[PDB]
Amino acid sequence: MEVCLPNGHQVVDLINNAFEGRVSIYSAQEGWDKTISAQPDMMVCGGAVVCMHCLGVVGSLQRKLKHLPHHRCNQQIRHQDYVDVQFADRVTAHWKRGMLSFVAQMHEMMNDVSPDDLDRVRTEGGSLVELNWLQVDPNSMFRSIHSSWTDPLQVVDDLDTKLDQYWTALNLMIDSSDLIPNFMMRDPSHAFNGVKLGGDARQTQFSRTFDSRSSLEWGVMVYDYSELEHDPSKGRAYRKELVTPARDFGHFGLSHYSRATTPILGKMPAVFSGMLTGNCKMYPFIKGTAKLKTVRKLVEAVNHAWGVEKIRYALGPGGMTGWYNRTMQQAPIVLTPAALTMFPDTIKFGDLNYPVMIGDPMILG
Amino acid sequence: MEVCLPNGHQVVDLINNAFEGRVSIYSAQEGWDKTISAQPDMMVCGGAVVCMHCLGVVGSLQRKLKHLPHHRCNQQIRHQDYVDVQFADRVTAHWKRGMLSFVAQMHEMMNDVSPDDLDRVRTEGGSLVELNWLQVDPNSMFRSIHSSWTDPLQVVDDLDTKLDQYWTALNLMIDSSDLIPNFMMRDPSHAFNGVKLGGDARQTQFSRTFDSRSSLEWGVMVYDYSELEHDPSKGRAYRKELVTPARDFGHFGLSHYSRATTPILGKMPAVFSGMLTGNCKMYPFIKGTAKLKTVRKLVEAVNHAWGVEKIRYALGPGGMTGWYNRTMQQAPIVLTPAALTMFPDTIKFGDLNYPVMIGDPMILG
Ligand SMILES: [Zn+2]
Ligand SMILES: [Zn+2]
């Protein structure tokens, strides 16, 4: 059968899904389970199922395909023409799992704090929990020289539900005791340009995305609150008044503002939507325009493999090149989760008072 | 508990849901079942659940609230301040049920056509099915002087699935036999500005929306193809070559283009997404800017019931007035289903060759 190209809205859905690590990929070898890496034969783009060898729509999501339908496939789309999407998706999937293990580790330590110690830190201030950074997602592509993005994805059922449950529990504990985490940012753009970098972290090269061009293996980055801990003029009352998150972000249970983390994994801050939005969803702090670039080579391949009339029929005015240029302009809206535009605007403490280092995530009073 | 206003993205979600007739409404009298109309006590706005007496967020979708939670309620938001949203939602809900009954009736009649009658019409041309317009959703607010938008909503489970199934089935039948429906439009904008109205249809006044100032009880509007039907020089071959839908919309099974209907109910064309989008979803042809107006009174009420700083905290700089004005400019993107901007642009027959009348929906060859 002859097939048609997907429409622009379907490609936008593909891109947005890749940056949540939720693209549904089918490979002959693994079926629809992408736990084990394999070259994609089909990808779900919005409501369509698309053949990755011609970029033709071969079915719908509602039809539940279990094989690649026979069709007249031009076979012009090469793996290299869409691997940037596969890469962004798989790396985001690994990154979300790593971030979950980290948030869960912090939650567990906080949950194990004895009442006496909590009571003491609330009163006199002081360290409450510290996580050896070498214990954060150790065997991942972000921390081990022996791992790669093509490694298997850790099997985690209900990933987003878990991320929501743990982040919510962790922040409510922080909020109720006016505690201080060193792994949060009021505006993650400051991680890329703004914060002072200390020690080994001064060498950090931020790509501000998930692509194959540069190194995603790096240390765990957090704030160095060493000076705050020992400043005799900035004790517990000072910390409660200005430093605890609620002062800048609003009380967690009564705020729509997003809370971002420092670059814990992949040199990429995570952004969590606020509790009042109804869920604490987690997204990588990547610009919409950077996400759109993942299909730049695919647009070139489509332009070379498909006739101009067929491209217009599916993508509209100006074809796929036109769709791409229009989307680049609309990216701040159509390729950007609301959470990424909901950081606090009235700051009292902020992100520029202490440097960021490669080191242990911690919570103090 | 103290409550805060919903954020702007949540209000946009509320509006988009109202124009799909899918707002979840809670009332003390009926619980979360809006089959029977009651004054709303809460409405789901995105992931938040909002008290309609103060417009404060009292919970989340995930918490599965069973009743209005105890909270510090200003009690200053009045029913009149948000009834425009309730009205758009309930009327759209009645309208979708009516459109479903109409599409099912046409599908049913098409399936009852004898093989011989179909063969004859395909070969010689002629009327195939004609639905007495007085039989289209006769007891609804769109057809009876004794009905009102506040009447009960017909109980229809899996409404969208049925709309998809019946529209898909009907169009495959029309496409496979190169048939001609008189209830389709290539660009529904022409219903309001473009088509010639014939006979009593000249009395029609289109509000282009669903609001209380509108008079939505009206006749069923379709094209008057009588001249085409009775002109021997515009016979079967002529109709197959130019008039059957595929010539303008592309073959149904191989097209992303939306197909709209004439104003069958409520003087409001329906827009169905194309099969290649993956589903045939149905939406009323209403502009995003018109949808946004449903909260104009609510914004004014919030501006007087809530302090400026609390409004800024939830809605962002500019407050709710700023949000409203910005959303008005973003409406083509954020309050407009993709289907409403996917009509064909290369037309051979089009919408302006025959007048629109109040009369019987029909399919002929
Ligand atoms: Zn193919
Ligand atoms: Zn209230």
Q: What is the CATH number of the domain that holds A217?
A: 3.90.1320.10
Closest CA to A138 of A154, A127, A150: A154
DSSP assignment of B270-308 equals EEE--GGGTS--EEE---HHHHHGGGHHHHHHHHHHS-H
Domain co-membership, A210 together with A158: yes
Q: Are residue A66 and residue A150 in the same domain, yes or no?
A: no
Whether residues B250 and A345 touch (CB distance < 8 A) is answered with no
Write the DSSP symbol of residue B201: G
Contact B316 A345 (CB under 8 A): yes
* Angle, helices A296-305/A319-334, rounded to nearest 10 degrees: 160
Considering only CB atoms, which chain B residues are within 8 Å of A165? Answer: none
**Other CB atoms within 10 A of residue B114 CB:** 8
Contact B342/B188 with Cβ under 8 angstroms?
A: no
**Contact at CB, B256 and A314, closer than 8 angstroms:** yes
- Token pair in block for residue A102: 């980290």
Interface residue B61 vs chain A (CB under 8 A)? yes
* Among A60, A334, A345, beta carbon nearest to B333: A334
Q: Strand, coil or helix: what is A129?
A: strand
A337 touches chain B (CB under 8 A): no
Residue written as token pair 């179909």: B118
Please state, in angstroms and rounded to a whole number, the distance separating the CA atoms of residues B299 and B292: 11
CA distance B198 to B189: 17
List beta partners, residue B24: none
Same domain, B28 and B159: no
| Alpha carbon distance A321, B153 (integer Å) | 46
Burial of B359 per CB tally in 10 Å (0-12, 13-18, 19+): buried
- Which residues does chain B have within 8 Å of residue A62's beta carbon, measured at their own beta carbons? 278-279
Query: B61 contacts in A (CB within 8 Å)?
Result: 278
- The answer to whether B338 touches A9, Cβ cutoff 8 Å, is yes
Taking the C-alpha atoms of residue B336 and residue A338, their distance in angstroms, rounded to an integer, is 17
User: Is B282 found in the same domain as B150?
Assistant: yes
CB B302 within 8 A of CB B45: no
Annotated resolution, angstroms: 1.8
Looking at the structure, do residues B298 and B190 belong to the same domain, yes or no? no
Select from B256, B326, B329 the residue whose CB has the most chain A CBs within 10 Å, as the one to mutate to test that interface.
B256
With beta carbons under 8 A apart, name residues in chain B contacting A164: 62
| Same domain? B310 vs B346 | no
Residues B261 and B124 in one domain: yes
Are both B181 and B99 inside the same structural domain? yes
| Host domain of residue A166 | 91-286+337-365
Which CATH number covers residue A20?
3.90.1630.10
Asked whether residue A351 falls in the same domain as residue A364, the answer is yes
- Rounded Cα distance between B155 and B153, Å, is 6
User: Residue B241 and residue B238: Cα distance in Å, rounded?
Assistant: 5
Residues B349, B247: Cα–Cα separation, whole Å: 8
Experimental method: X-ray
d(CA A162, CA A184): 19
Chain A to chain B, count of Cβ pairs less than 8 Å apart?
80
Query: Do A231 and A278 fall within a single domain?
Result: yes
CA B86 from chain centre, in angstroms, equals: 15
B313 touching A, CB under 8 A?
A: yes
Total number of domains in chain A: 2
Measure B309 CA to ligand 2 centroid, in angstroms: 18
Chain position carrying tokens 């009651």: B38
Both A61 and A178 in one domain: the answer is: no
Residues B240 and B174: their CA atoms lie apart, in Å, by: 11
Top residue of B2, B4, B7, B172 to mutate, by most chain A CBs within 10 Å, is B7
Structure tokens at B205: 């006044």
Pairwise CA distance, residues A92 & A218, whole Å? 16
Q: Which two tokens stand for residue A85?
A: 């999407």
Residue with tokens 């400026």: B308
- Pair B158, B234 in one domain: yes
